[PDB]
Symmetry: C2
Subunit: 201 residues, 2 copies
């Protein structure tokens, strides 16, 4: 159960969907291919499962951060929503690493798996996230928010790569202090970006 | 030398660096592996060459567009610079095979291993990004290197993702919204990037 998913997570992050084999996944779990086929059916299904588990934990925490927000006496704003969506991707506990790496390669996966992935696991919550921003007091431009959400995803997928790109570009002078610094900077950036799109329409 | 490279680019775009083989590239090129090896050294160096040719066309365009900027009498701002950097990644001749393959290839860059991925940043992307940051650093009110530098990293992330050609906006608006055109895409990223640079800048000052 949990062993086979963890090892398959590792092997997919490393080789992508096509490159991975159940042969390799069986070897690192000490089981037969047969037993996997039994539990999971097809390489695609196993792959979907790895994503179901990963994104189930993240969206549960997203939902908890959103419930806390909607319980504040003072209310909330766009900034708060964006930060709500981002933290769960970045708050770690090598559990965290492999799913982060895996997600970061999503764009190079075949449409045969990417399209169902997006439709079944990401769309629902992104739409929900967009709707929440529409409910806020700055916002009745769906265009600005929806584009902003597309740009968010691109930022998330890249940041999940774990590359210290800011370090590489500033000859070491600038670094991300932490995951919360990364989240904070993306939150501000996106919130401002959404605003500029709204203010130019 | 403009043929093995075109085949290499196709195979690399479809299969990635690890999955591509010099064997298939040679078969699709109607030459031997040995001849490919003779001109290009190693699979890692063919790959680099595919990206050298590609980013050379792109960066020469960027340099012309920034030159055009610096010759406008009324001047230019952050927005104009950002547009400069984005344009050659998205403007294409239509139906534009050369642009398509290289777009697709660059879109997959995140899934390449560090043995090609790191040299590509080092050798091919850094110089032009640093120059980009510098040019923006000469447009007051803008003396926040952090704001602009994070802006650039977030620039790049949206480029690599948009190059995939996935109608993400469509999927999320159940069809109600789409890119009108390449220029509409560039336009939207530029305003987003410029605004975001501002919000980062505006969050640093104030005690």
């Amino acid at each position: 159960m949990e062993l086979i998913l963890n090892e398959a997570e590792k092997v997919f992050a490393m080789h992508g969907f096509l490159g991975a084999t159940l042969k390799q996944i069986a070897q690192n779990s000490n089981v037969t291919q047969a037993l996997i086929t039994y539990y999971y059916g097809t390489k695609q299904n196993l792959f979907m499962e790895v994503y179901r588990r990963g994104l189930s934990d993240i969206d549960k925490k997203r939902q908890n951060y959103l419930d806390e927000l909607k319980s504040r006496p003072e209310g909330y704003n766009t900034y708060d929503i964006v930060r709500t969506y981002l933290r769960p991707q970045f708050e770690h506990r090598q559990a965290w690493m492999h799913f982060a790496r895996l997600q970061s390669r999503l764009a190079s996966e075949p449409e045969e798996v990417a399209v169902p992935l997006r439709k079944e696991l990401y769309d629902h919550t992104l739409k929900a996230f967009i709707h929440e921003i529409m409910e806020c007091e700055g916002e009745d431009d769906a265009a600005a928010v929806s584009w902003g959400a597309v740009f968010m995803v691109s930022m998330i997928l890249y940041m999940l790569r774990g590359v210290d790109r800011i370090g590489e570009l500033t000859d070491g002078h600038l670094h991300a202090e932490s995951e919360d610094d990364i989240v904070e900077r993306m939150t501000i950036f996106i919130t401002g970006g959404i605003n500029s799109l709204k203010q130019a329409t």
